[PDB]
């Protein structure tokens, strides 16, 4: 067939019950995730092609970057709680991987301050149990699928995107194939 298990996607041998519809995982340390987000814009183009009533969830992971990697998962929780993902994603990726100016939790905080989040608001969120709950949700979701590589995208806790079965001679074609596969899987 045109889409086949083991090709554009794989099937989870143990399907995850109650999982978000479209679940993306990434790390601000992850060089391929930088490409996916800053160059290819995977999330946006997927989000874009999604059917109506299909929600998209994106979570950070801990297993890259040690202590700072864990700080970044908490900061992504702050980003989600405040609703400022579209303001901090670019400067977080560039601070970690382009300028390499992000070396501490304080450097992370600087990115939010510069993006216009007030110091008091960041700190209250950072220290909040709402954010601790959001950290826990990110860890649980990754745990549910034995997650050990990023970038990754899962559909309905059953299917895992497989970009390795896609041509990358043209970036735009790769992206739309990826997006159309997510759409196909969400309709499945
Ligand atoms: C794990 N994902 C890696 C991957 C797979 C397919 C294509 C790419 C890229 C194409 C252009 C920049 S990056 C990266």
Domain count, the chain: 1
Domain of residue 45, CATH code: 3.40.30.10
Cβ contact 61:23 at 8 Å: no
First to last CA, the chain: 14
Q: Is 59 helix (H, G, I), strand (E, B) or coil?
A: strand
Q: Is 10 helix (H, G, I), strand (E, B) or coil?
A: strand
Experimental technique for the deposited model: X-ray
Q: How far is CA 88 from the centre of its chain?
A: 13
Cβ contact 178:45 at 8 Å: yes
Residue 143: other Cβ atoms inside 10 A? 10
Residue 184 neighbours by CB under 8 Å, 6+ apart: 3
Q: What angle do CA 22, 153, 53 make, to 5 degrees?
A: 15
162 lines ligand 1 (CB under 6 A): no
Distance (Å, rounded) from C-alpha 16 to C-alpha 74?
24
User: How much distance in Å is there from the Cα of 32 to the middle of ligand 1?
Assistant: 6
* DSSP code per residue over 92-150: HHIIIIIS----SHHHHHHHHHHTT--HHHHHHHHT-HHHHHHHHHHHHHHHHTT--SS
* Residue carrying structure tokens 């699928």: 145
Q: How far is CA 102 from the centre of its chain?
A: 19
CA distances from 105 to 95, 121, 133, 145, 156 (A): 12, 15, 19, 28, 33
- Candidate from 174, 176, 181 with most ligand 1 atoms within 8 A of CB, to mutate: 174
* Residue carrying structure tokens 């299917």: 159
CA distances from 4 to 7, 11, 156, 162, 188 (A): 5, 10, 17, 11, 12
User: How much distance in Å is there from the Cα of 184 to the middle of ligand 1?
Assistant: 20
User: How much distance in Å is there from the Cα of 139 to the middle of ligand 1?
Assistant: 24
Cβ contact 138:77 at 8 Å: yes
Q: Is 15 helix (H, G, I), strand (E, B) or coil?
A: coil
Quote the tokens at residue 19.
């999982």
136 lines ligand 1 (CB under 6 A): no
CA distances from 173 to 17, 45, 96, 167, 176 (A): 32, 11, 28, 8, 5
Domain encompassing residue 103: 1-188
35 lines ligand 1 (CB under 6 A): yes
151 lines ligand 1 (CB under 6 A): yes
Give the orientation angle of helix 119-126 with respect to helix 129-144, to 10 degrees.
Answer: 60
User: How much distance in Å is there from the Cα of 174 to the middle of ligand 1?
Assistant: 9
Q: In what order do the strands lie in the sheet with 152-155?
A: 9-11, 159-161, 152-155, 22-26, 56-60
Ligand 1 atom 3: residue of nearest CA: 32
Distance (Å, rounded) from C-alpha 118 to C-alpha 90?
18
- Candidate from 36, 38, 61 with most ligand 1 atoms within 8 A of CB, to mutate: 36
* Peptide bond between residue 34 and the one before it cis (omega within 30 degrees of 0): no
């Amino acid at each position: 067939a045109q889409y086949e298990d083991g090709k554009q996607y794989t099937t989870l041998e143990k399907p995850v019950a109650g999982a978000p519809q479209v679940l993306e995982f990434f790390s601000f340390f992850c060089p391929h995730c930088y490409q996916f987000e800053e160059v290819l814009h995977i999330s946006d183009n997927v989000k874009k092609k999604l059917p109506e009533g299909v929600k998209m969830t994106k979570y950070h992971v801990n297993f890259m970057g040690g202590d700072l990697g864990k700080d970044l998962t908490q900061a992504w929780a702050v980003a989600m709680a405040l609703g400022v993902e579209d303001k901090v994603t670019v400067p977080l990726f560039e601070g970690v991987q382009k300028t390499q100016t992000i070396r501490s939790a304080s450097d992370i905080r600087d990115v939010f301050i510069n993006a216009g989040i007030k110091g008091e608001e960041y700190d209250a969120a950072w220290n909040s149990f709402v954010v601790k709950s959001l950290v826990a949700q990110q860890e649980k979701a990754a745990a549910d699928v034995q997650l050990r590589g990023v970038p990754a995208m899962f559909v309905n806790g059953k299917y895992q995107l497989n970009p390795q079965g896609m041509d990358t001679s043209n970036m735009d074609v790769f992206v739309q194939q990826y997006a159309d596969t997510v759409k196909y899987l969400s309709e499945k």
